[PDB]
Amino acid sequence: ECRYWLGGCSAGQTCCKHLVCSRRHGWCVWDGTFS
């Protein structure tokens, strides 16, 4: 299943809609706002 904000993605994980796997933060961040 997809993870939510600050869910904690990985190399083989995914993030729910409106979110992106932040490899820098180490967790799913808001897509469109993150850096």
Domain boundaries, the chain: 1-35
d(CA 14, CA 12): 7
Name the CA radius of gyration of the chain, rounded. 8
Q: How far apart are the first and last CA of the chain?
A: 25
Question: Which residue carries 């961040």 as its tokens?
Answer: 29
Identify each DSSP E strand in 1-35 by its residue range.
Answer: 19-22, 27-30
SS3 1: coil
d(CA 27, CA 5): 7
Task: Centre a 10 Å sphere on the Cβ of residue 29 and count the other Cβ atoms it contains.
Answer: 20
d(CA 17, CA 24): 19
User: Which helix (DSSP H) or strand (DSSP E) does residue 11 occupy?
Assistant: none
Taking a C-beta distance cutoff of 8 angstroms, is the pair 30, 18 a contact? yes
How many residues are there in the chain? Answer: 35
d(CA 1, CA 25): 20
